[PDB]
Swiss-Prot record, chains A, B, C, D, E, F, G:
Gene Ontology BP, a term: viral capsid assembly
Name the record gives this protein: Capsid assembly protein Gp31
Upper taxonomic lineage: Viruses, Duplodnaviria, Heunggongvirae, Uroviricota, Caudoviricetes
Gene3D superfamilies, A to Z: GroES chaperonin (2.30.33.40)
InterPro entries linked: Chaperonin_GroES, Chaperonin_GroES_sf, GroES-like_sf, Phage_T4_Gp31_GroEL
The protein's role, per its UniProt record: Essential for proper capsid assembly. In absence of Gp31 the major capsid protein (Gp23) assembles into 'lumps'. Acts as a co-chaperonin with the host groEL protein.
Highest taxon of source: Viruses
Ribosomal protein as UniProt keyword: no
Pfam families hit by this protein: Cpn10 (PF00166)
Organism: Enterobacteria phage T4
Record keywords, A-Z: Chaperone, Early protein, Viral capsid assembly, Viral release from host cell
Alphabetized GO MF terms: ATP binding; protein folding chaperone
CDD domains (UniProt xref): cpn10
Amino acid sequence: QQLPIRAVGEYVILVSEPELCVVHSVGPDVPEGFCEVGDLTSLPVGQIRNVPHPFVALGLKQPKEIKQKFVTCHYKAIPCLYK
Amino acid sequence: QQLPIRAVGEYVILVSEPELCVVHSVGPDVPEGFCEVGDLTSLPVGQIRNVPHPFVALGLKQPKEIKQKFVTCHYKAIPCLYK
Amino acid sequence: QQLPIRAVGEYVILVSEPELCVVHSVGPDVPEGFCEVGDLTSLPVGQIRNVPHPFVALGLKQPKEIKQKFVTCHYKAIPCLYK
Amino acid sequence: QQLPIRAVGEYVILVSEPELCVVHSVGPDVPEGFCEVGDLTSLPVGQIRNVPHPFVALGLKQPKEIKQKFVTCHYKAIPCLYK
Amino acid sequence: QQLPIRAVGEYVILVSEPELCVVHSVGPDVPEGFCEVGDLTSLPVGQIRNVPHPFVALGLKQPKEIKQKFVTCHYKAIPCLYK
Amino acid sequence: QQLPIRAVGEYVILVSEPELCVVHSVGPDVPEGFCEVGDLTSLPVGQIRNVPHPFVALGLKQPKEIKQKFVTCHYKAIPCLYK
Amino acid sequence: QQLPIRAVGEYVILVSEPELCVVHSVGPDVPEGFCEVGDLTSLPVGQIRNVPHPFVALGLKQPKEIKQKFVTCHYKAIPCLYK
């Protein structure tokens, strides 16, 4: 799952499911033991923000040919884990 | 009542009654002794947010075939318990 | 006056007069000596929120057959007591 | 001037002049030496809130037959005293 | 310049020039050495609030026959002194 | 460049270029080593506020005959220096 | 990449890619180890603000003949690095 994209501060980067999302990266300021990579959760569309796919960002591919969707949100917006 | 869904931070996950709700899970940051699982309370529709049922989240079932409704809200939005 | 409904945190639960209200329950976080149960006060309709009657909440009765009206508000919204 | 109405917390209860108002009661949380009962001040209508007269509150009289007007506001909204 | 009107808390009372204003009174909570009475400054109309002239407040005169205009604002809204 | 106008608190007074501006005065509460007088910077028109020229303020001249434009803004609105 | 423009406080100055951006300068108040110059990231257009190119600011060139686009944003608005 690891690509070149990391969450900073109190943010968390998730990956949308084929909004159900999976934790991909947890910012270093998110309190320890808050959640873990791989954890599935649910966030309202209005609470998360789409993040450009690292390939598009690293100028390799075009948005259209990217299937995986990365989103971000502050950790305080996460209410649960299906864990 | 325990399914694979837990509240994090200062949130609380309730289950709507057949808005009258029952505490299902209390975030680890909610002050100790605030409330207990099983406790019944009332919250204005505008204060709570619907949470996808863990089966829908874990991709097992379809929303339509789920009867139980999970909602979440910050603990400070809870004013009372019918306890 | 005691029914199965208690105020939590910094909230206060009052009962509307036949908005003139009477303190019914004071949250454990309301500063000590702020007010007392039985105290009469006045709050603008816009500052308080209606709370479902514990019987309706505990599924015993129907809203229509309930005369007593419970409301809630944060303690900082209370400016005086007719004490 | 003392009727059964007291200011709580950081609020202050004034009485409108026949908005020019006179301090009637100072909440226990208003910093000591902020103002004194009897002090005259001026507040914009939008900063203060009307408070039901204690007789109306204590169900003795009707609003119409009350001449004295009580209002409230947070102490930080008070900029001066005509003292 | 001293009339019966004083600034409280973090407020400052100025007198509009015949918005160019002159400091008339500095609230006791305004940090020491912030400004001095007599100091001229400039504030946007939207940052200040008109204060009833102490004579009108003390019921001596009518607004129309008052030429001096008193205004108030929080000290943090003051950016400079023409000193 | 020094005229009779100084910045107070956390504000900074700049002078618009013939929005490109030059620091003219730094409030005593702006953290030490934040910037220096003479420093050129850029601020969005919406972040700054026009300040009356000290001559207009000190009632010497008319706005129309003033070419130099003074503006102010909180130091936290300054992102860079062309230094 | 170094031109005469530096980020102050908790801001960060980036350079838009030919919104994908590259860190050009990190304010001295941005927590140590937050990011590094040269790091690529993605920010929503609404979170960043355009900054005048230092040449335009230093009055050398005209906006039209500048290709490089500098933008700024608070460090807390940065969720990831394609690092």
